[PDB]
Protein backbone atom coordinates (compact mmCIF):
# COMPACT_ATOMS: atom_id res chain seq x y z
CA UNK A 1 0.00 0.00 0.00
CA UNK A 2 1.64 3.23 -1.18
CA UNK A 3 0.44 6.29 0.81
CA UNK A 4 -0.74 8.70 -1.88
CA UNK A 5 -1.43 11.67 0.42
CA UNK A 6 0.98 12.57 3.18
CA UNK A 7 -1.76 14.83 4.63
CA UNK A 8 -4.12 11.86 4.98
CA UNK A 9 -7.05 13.65 3.28
CA UNK A 10 -6.90 16.38 5.99
CA UNK A 11 -6.08 19.38 3.74
CA UNK A 12 -7.88 20.87 0.79
CA UNK A 13 -5.50 19.17 -1.59
CA UNK A 14 -3.41 16.03 -1.32
CA UNK A 15 0.29 16.27 -0.64
CA UNK A 16 2.32 13.69 -2.60
CA UNK A 17 5.62 12.03 -1.69
CA UNK A 18 8.63 11.52 -3.89
CA UNK A 19 10.39 9.40 -4.93
CA UNK A 20 7.71 6.72 -5.70
CA UNK A 21 7.94 3.96 -3.13
CA UNK A 22 9.59 6.21 -0.53
CA UNK A 23 7.86 7.79 2.49
CA UNK A 24 8.93 9.95 5.40
CA UNK A 25 9.04 8.62 8.97
CA UNK A 26 5.48 8.25 10.25
CA UNK A 27 3.81 10.99 12.25
CA UNK A 28 0.25 11.90 13.21
CA UNK A 29 -1.10 14.41 10.74
CA UNK A 30 -3.06 17.44 11.85
CA UNK A 31 -4.07 20.33 9.70
CA UNK A 32 -4.32 22.56 12.73
CA UNK A 33 -2.63 23.25 16.08
CA UNK A 34 -3.64 20.86 18.86
CA UNK A 35 -3.31 21.12 22.63
CA UNK A 36 -0.03 19.82 23.93
CA UNK A 37 1.41 19.41 27.40
CA UNK A 38 1.78 22.68 29.25
CA UNK A 39 -0.37 24.70 26.92
CA UNK A 40 -2.50 27.09 29.01
CA UNK A 41 -4.65 28.18 26.04
CA UNK A 42 -6.49 25.64 23.83
CA UNK A 43 -5.62 26.83 20.35
CA UNK A 44 -8.98 25.58 19.03
CA UNK A 45 -11.06 27.68 21.45
CA UNK A 46 -12.52 30.99 20.28
CA UNK A 47 -11.01 33.99 22.21
CA UNK A 48 -11.91 36.86 19.85
CA UNK A 49 -15.45 38.04 19.38
CA UNK A 50 -14.89 39.29 15.86
CA UNK A 51 -15.96 42.39 13.97
CA UNK A 52 -19.40 43.83 13.61
CA UNK A 53 -19.47 44.15 9.84
CA UNK A 54 -22.46 42.55 8.24
CA UNK A 55 -24.08 45.04 5.92
CA UNK A 56 -20.96 45.97 3.92
CA UNK A 57 -17.54 44.42 3.41
CA UNK A 58 -14.88 44.52 6.00
CA UNK A 59 -12.74 47.57 5.37
CA UNK A 60 -10.18 49.51 7.35
CA UNK A 61 -11.78 52.15 9.55
CA UNK A 62 -15.01 50.23 10.11
CA UNK A 63 -13.77 46.67 10.67
CA UNK A 64 -12.29 45.96 14.09
CA UNK A 65 -10.40 43.08 12.50
CA UNK A 66 -8.58 45.54 10.22
CA UNK A 67 -7.22 48.06 12.69
CA UNK A 68 -3.89 48.23 10.81
CA UNK A 69 -5.13 48.35 7.24
CA UNK A 70 -5.86 45.43 4.97
CA UNK A 71 -3.70 42.39 5.50
CA UNK A 72 -4.37 40.95 2.10
CA UNK A 73 -5.10 42.07 -1.40
CA UNK A 74 -7.87 40.96 -3.64
CA UNK A 75 -5.75 38.02 -4.89
CA UNK A 76 -5.29 36.88 -1.29
CA UNK A 77 -1.68 38.00 -1.28
CA UNK A 78 -0.11 39.33 1.95
CA UNK A 79 0.33 43.05 1.40
CA UNK A 80 3.76 44.58 2.16
CA UNK A 81 10.28 49.43 14.14
CA UNK A 82 7.06 47.88 15.58
CA UNK A 83 5.06 45.29 13.62
CA UNK A 84 1.30 45.45 13.20
CA UNK A 85 -0.44 42.27 14.45
CA UNK A 86 -2.51 40.38 11.90
CA UNK A 87 -6.06 39.33 12.69
CA UNK A 88 -8.25 37.50 10.18
CA UNK A 89 -12.03 37.58 10.35
CA UNK A 90 -13.09 34.53 12.33
CA UNK A 91 -15.95 32.17 12.99
CA UNK A 92 -17.79 34.91 14.89
CA UNK A 93 -17.43 37.68 12.32
CA UNK A 94 -20.67 38.02 10.38
CA UNK A 95 -18.94 38.99 7.17
CA UNK A 96 -19.26 36.29 4.52
CA UNK A 97 -16.78 33.56 3.97
CA UNK A 98 -15.76 35.64 0.90
CA UNK A 99 -14.40 38.36 3.07
CA UNK A 100 -10.92 39.43 1.82
CA UNK A 101 -9.65 39.17 5.38
CA UNK A 102 -10.10 35.34 5.42
CA UNK A 103 -6.99 33.76 3.87
CA UNK A 104 -4.96 31.49 6.22
CA UNK A 105 -8.22 30.01 7.38
CA UNK A 106 -9.07 28.81 3.86
CA UNK A 107 -6.21 26.27 3.97
CA UNK A 108 -3.90 24.93 1.28
CA UNK A 109 -4.35 26.25 -2.23
CA UNK A 110 -1.45 24.55 -4.01
CA UNK A 111 -0.27 21.01 -4.59
CA UNK A 112 2.83 20.28 -2.59
CA UNK A 113 5.07 17.25 -2.43
CA UNK A 114 7.24 15.96 0.38
CA UNK A 115 10.43 14.81 -1.33
CA UNK A 116 13.87 13.42 -0.55
CA UNK A 117 16.48 16.15 -0.75
CA UNK A 118 20.18 15.51 -1.50
CA UNK A 119 21.54 16.31 2.00
CA UNK A 120 18.77 17.78 4.19
CA UNK A 121 16.48 14.72 4.61
CA UNK A 122 12.93 15.19 3.50
CA UNK A 123 11.73 18.60 2.29
CA UNK A 124 8.59 20.22 0.91
CA UNK A 125 8.34 21.57 -2.58
CA UNK A 126 5.58 23.05 -4.64
CA UNK A 127 4.45 21.26 -7.78
CA UNK A 128 3.03 24.47 -9.10
CA UNK A 129 3.71 28.12 -9.52
CA UNK A 130 3.06 30.20 -6.39
CA UNK A 131 2.72 33.99 -6.83
CA UNK A 132 4.57 36.24 -4.43
CA UNK A 133 2.53 36.93 -1.36
CA UNK A 134 0.27 33.91 -1.57
CA UNK A 135 -0.39 31.81 1.55
CA UNK A 136 1.50 28.60 1.36
CA UNK A 137 0.95 26.67 4.58
CA UNK A 138 0.94 26.86 8.38
CA UNK A 139 3.51 25.46 10.69
CA UNK A 140 1.03 23.62 12.94
CA UNK A 141 1.40 21.01 15.70
CA UNK A 142 1.19 20.61 19.42
CA UNK A 143 1.09 23.89 21.31
CA UNK A 144 3.39 23.37 24.31
CA UNK A 145 4.30 25.11 27.45
CA UNK A 146 7.80 26.33 28.17
CA UNK A 147 8.72 23.53 30.61
CA UNK A 148 7.44 20.87 28.25
CA UNK A 149 9.64 22.46 25.56
CA UNK A 150 12.62 22.21 27.85
CA UNK A 151 11.77 18.62 28.62
CA UNK A 152 11.59 17.63 24.95
CA UNK A 153 14.59 19.58 23.75
CA UNK A 154 16.85 18.00 26.34
CA UNK A 155 16.15 14.59 24.77
CA UNK A 156 17.09 15.63 21.21
CA UNK A 157 19.80 13.21 19.99
CA UNK A 158 22.41 13.96 17.26
CA UNK A 159 20.61 12.78 14.10
CA UNK A 160 17.13 13.87 15.32
CA UNK A 161 15.34 16.38 13.04
CA UNK A 162 14.48 19.31 15.42
CA UNK A 163 11.00 20.83 14.93
CA UNK A 164 10.02 22.93 17.91
CA UNK A 165 9.67 26.63 17.19
CA UNK A 166 9.41 29.49 19.68
CA UNK A 167 7.40 32.56 18.78
CA UNK A 168 7.75 35.62 21.00
CA UNK A 169 5.69 38.66 20.28
CA UNK A 170 6.36 41.91 22.19
CA UNK A 171 5.46 39.21 25.82
CA UNK A 172 3.15 36.64 24.21
CA UNK A 173 5.07 33.41 23.82
CA UNK A 174 3.93 30.39 21.72
CA UNK A 175 5.75 27.09 21.32
CA UNK A 176 4.71 24.85 18.48
CA UNK A 177 5.97 21.35 18.01
CA UNK A 178 4.93 19.31 14.94
CA UNK A 179 7.42 16.49 15.76
CA UNK A 180 4.77 13.86 16.64
CA UNK A 181 1.50 15.54 15.71
CA UNK A 182 1.84 18.20 13.01
CA UNK A 183 0.98 19.47 9.60
CA UNK A 184 2.97 19.50 6.35
CA UNK A 185 4.91 22.57 7.45
CA UNK A 186 7.09 20.27 9.56
CA UNK A 187 8.85 19.30 6.29
CA UNK A 188 10.07 22.81 5.48
CA UNK A 189 13.82 23.02 5.43
CA UNK A 190 15.79 26.08 6.43
CA UNK A 191 17.35 28.40 3.98
CA UNK A 192 19.59 31.40 4.56
CA UNK A 193 17.76 32.95 1.60
CA UNK A 194 14.39 31.40 1.94
CA UNK A 195 11.31 31.81 -0.14
CA UNK A 196 8.72 31.85 2.63
CA UNK A 197 8.04 34.40 5.32
CA UNK A 198 6.33 33.33 8.57
CA UNK A 199 3.70 35.70 10.01
CA UNK A 200 1.76 35.08 13.28
CA UNK A 201 -1.86 35.26 12.19
CA UNK A 202 -4.71 35.26 14.72
CA UNK A 203 -8.12 33.95 13.76
CA UNK A 204 -10.32 32.40 16.48
CA UNK A 205 -7.67 32.06 19.15
CA UNK A 206 -5.05 34.00 21.02
CA UNK A 207 -2.69 31.16 19.93
CA UNK A 208 -1.48 32.42 16.56
CA UNK A 209 -1.30 30.47 13.39
CA UNK A 210 2.29 30.43 12.08
CA UNK A 211 1.43 31.25 8.52
CA UNK A 212 4.08 30.94 5.75
CA UNK A 213 3.57 33.20 2.72
CA UNK A 214 5.57 33.22 -0.45
CA UNK A 215 8.21 35.96 -0.16
CA UNK A 216 8.82 35.83 -3.95
CA UNK A 217 7.35 33.98 -6.92
CA UNK A 218 8.10 30.26 -6.39
CA UNK A 219 8.28 28.09 -9.45
CA UNK A 220 7.13 24.54 -9.99
CA UNK A 221 9.32 21.97 -8.17
CA UNK A 222 11.04 24.73 -6.22
CA UNK A 223 11.75 23.64 -2.68
CA UNK A 224 9.92 25.67 -0.01
CA UNK A 225 12.03 27.02 2.86
CA UNK A 226 11.95 29.49 5.67
CA UNK A 227 14.57 31.01 7.90
CA UNK A 228 14.85 28.97 11.08
CA UNK A 229 16.25 32.09 12.89
CA UNK A 230 13.20 34.04 11.85
CA UNK A 231 15.41 36.96 10.76
CA UNK A 232 14.42 37.04 7.07
CA UNK A 233 12.37 40.17 6.41
CA UNK A 234 11.89 40.55 10.13
CA UNK A 235 12.59 44.22 10.51
CA UNK A 236 10.77 45.04 13.69
CA UNK A 237 11.50 44.43 17.40
CA UNK A 238 8.08 42.84 17.79
CA UNK A 239 8.26 39.13 16.92
CA UNK A 240 11.08 36.62 17.16
CA UNK A 241 10.43 33.22 15.50
CA UNK A 242 13.17 30.77 16.42
CA UNK A 243 13.58 27.09 15.80
CA UNK A 244 15.05 25.32 18.83
CA UNK A 245 17.47 22.46 19.20
CA UNK A 246 19.63 20.80 21.79
CA UNK A 247 23.29 20.68 22.23
CA UNK A 248 26.19 22.80 21.53
CA UNK A 249 27.29 21.56 18.04
CA UNK A 250 26.51 24.08 15.32
CA UNK A 251 24.75 21.98 12.64
CA UNK A 252 25.91 22.65 9.07
CA UNK A 253 23.57 24.32 6.63
CA UNK A 254 23.35 22.97 3.07
CA UNK A 255 20.79 25.49 1.84
CA UNK A 256 23.02 26.49 -1.16
CA UNK A 257 22.30 30.18 -0.90
CA UNK A 258 25.10 32.63 -1.80
CA UNK A 259 24.73 34.32 1.60
CA UNK A 260 24.77 30.92 3.41
CA UNK A 261 26.26 31.26 6.91
CA UNK A 262 27.17 27.51 6.81
CA UNK A 263 25.23 26.83 10.01
CA UNK A 264 21.67 26.00 10.74
CA UNK A 265 20.58 28.81 13.08
CA UNK A 266 18.78 26.95 15.89
CA UNK A 267 18.52 28.42 19.34
CA UNK A 268 20.30 25.70 21.33
CA UNK A 269 19.61 24.42 24.85
N1 LIG B 1 19.45 24.05 5.24
C2 LIG B 1 19.56 22.87 5.87
N3 LIG B 1 20.79 22.22 5.87
C4 LIG B 1 20.96 21.01 6.46
N5 LIG B 1 19.97 20.27 7.07
C6 LIG B 1 18.78 20.94 7.12
C7 LIG B 1 18.52 22.17 6.51
N8 LIG B 1 17.23 22.50 6.74
C9 LIG B 1 16.65 21.54 7.42
N10 LIG B 1 17.59 20.54 7.67
C11 LIG B 1 17.37 19.23 8.32
O12 LIG B 1 15.97 19.17 8.64
C13 LIG B 1 15.78 19.27 10.06
C14 LIG B 1 14.63 20.21 10.40
S15 LIG B 1 12.99 19.51 10.17
C16 LIG B 1 12.82 19.68 8.37
C17 LIG B 1 12.35 18.38 7.71
C18 LIG B 1 13.47 17.31 7.82
N19 LIG B 1 14.53 17.51 6.78
C20 LIG B 1 12.92 15.88 7.69
O21 LIG B 1 13.47 15.06 6.96
O22 LIG B 1 11.87 15.59 8.35
C23 LIG B 1 17.11 19.74 10.56
O24 LIG B 1 17.31 19.34 11.95
C25 LIG B 1 18.10 19.10 9.64
O26 LIG B 1 18.20 17.68 9.86
ZN1 LIG C 1 -15.18 43.33 9.63
ZN1 LIG D 1 -13.84 40.29 11.30
ZN1 LIG E 1 -14.54 40.08 7.44
ZN1 LIG F 1 22.43 28.24 4.50
Q: Which residues contact 1 (CB under 8 A, 6 or more apart)?
A: none
Q: Which residues contact 61 (CB under 8 A, 6 or more apart)?
A: none
Cα–Cα distance measured from residue 68 to residue 198, given in angstroms and rounded to the nearest whole number: 18
Q: Are 150 and 175 in contact (CB under 8 A)?
A: no
- Among 169, 137, 181, smallest CA distance to 240 is for 169
Ligand 1, residues 189, 191, 192, 253: which to mutate, most atoms within 8 A of Cβ?
A: 189
Residue of the nearest CA to atom 10 in ligand 1?
120
Cα–Cα distance measured from residue 245 to residue 77, given in angstroms and rounded to the nearest whole number: 32
Containing 124, the helix (H) or strand (E) segment is strand 122-126
**Omega into 19 within 30° of 0, i.e. cis?**
yes
Please give, one letter per residue, the 3-state secondary structure of 140-193.
CEEEECHHHHHHHHCCCCCCCCCCCEEEEECCEEEEEEEEEEECHHHHCEECCC
CB environment 95-113: b (16+ within 10 A), e (fewer): beeebbbbbbbeebbbebb
CA of 219 to the centre of ligand 4 (A): 31
DSSP structural state of residue 20:
T
Method used to solve the structure: X-ray
Cα–Cα distance measured from residue 24 to residue 198, given in angstroms and rounded to the nearest whole number: 24
The residues lining ligand 1, judged by C-beta closer than 6 Å to any ligand atom, are: 24, 120-123, 161-163, 187, 189-191, 253-255, 264
Q: Are 241 and 138 in contact (CB under 8 A)?
A: no
Q: Find the CATH number of the domain harbouring 242.
A: 2.170.270.10
Which residues fall in the annotated binding site for S-adenosyl-L-methionine?
120-122, 163, 186, 189-190
Cα–Cα distance measured from residue 73 to residue 70, given in angstroms and rounded to the nearest whole number: 7
Cα–Cα distance measured from residue 10 to residue 227, given in angstroms and rounded to the nearest whole number: 26
DSSP structural state of residue 80:
-
Number of domains in the chain: 1
Strand order in the sheet with 86-87: 86-87, 196-202, 209-214, 135-138
* Residue 267 C-beta-side C-alpha neighbours within 13 Å: 16
Number of H helices, E strands in the chain: 1, 16
CA of 259 to the centre of ligand 5 (A): 7
Q: Are 186 and 217 in contact (CB under 8 A)?
A: no
Residue of the nearest CA to atom 20 in ligand 1?
122
How many other C-beta atoms can be found within 10 angstroms of the C-beta atom of residue 149? 22
Q: Provide the residue range defining the domain that includes 229.
A: 1-269
Quote the distance between the C-alpha of residue 103 and its chain's center.
13
Amino acid sequence: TEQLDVACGQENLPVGAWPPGAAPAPFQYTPDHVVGPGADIDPTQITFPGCICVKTPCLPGTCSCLRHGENYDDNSCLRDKYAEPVFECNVLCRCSDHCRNRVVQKGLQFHFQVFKTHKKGWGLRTLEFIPKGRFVCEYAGEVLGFSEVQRRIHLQTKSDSNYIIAIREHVMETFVDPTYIGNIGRFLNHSCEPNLLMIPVRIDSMVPKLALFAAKDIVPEEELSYDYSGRYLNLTVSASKERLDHGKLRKPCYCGAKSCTAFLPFDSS
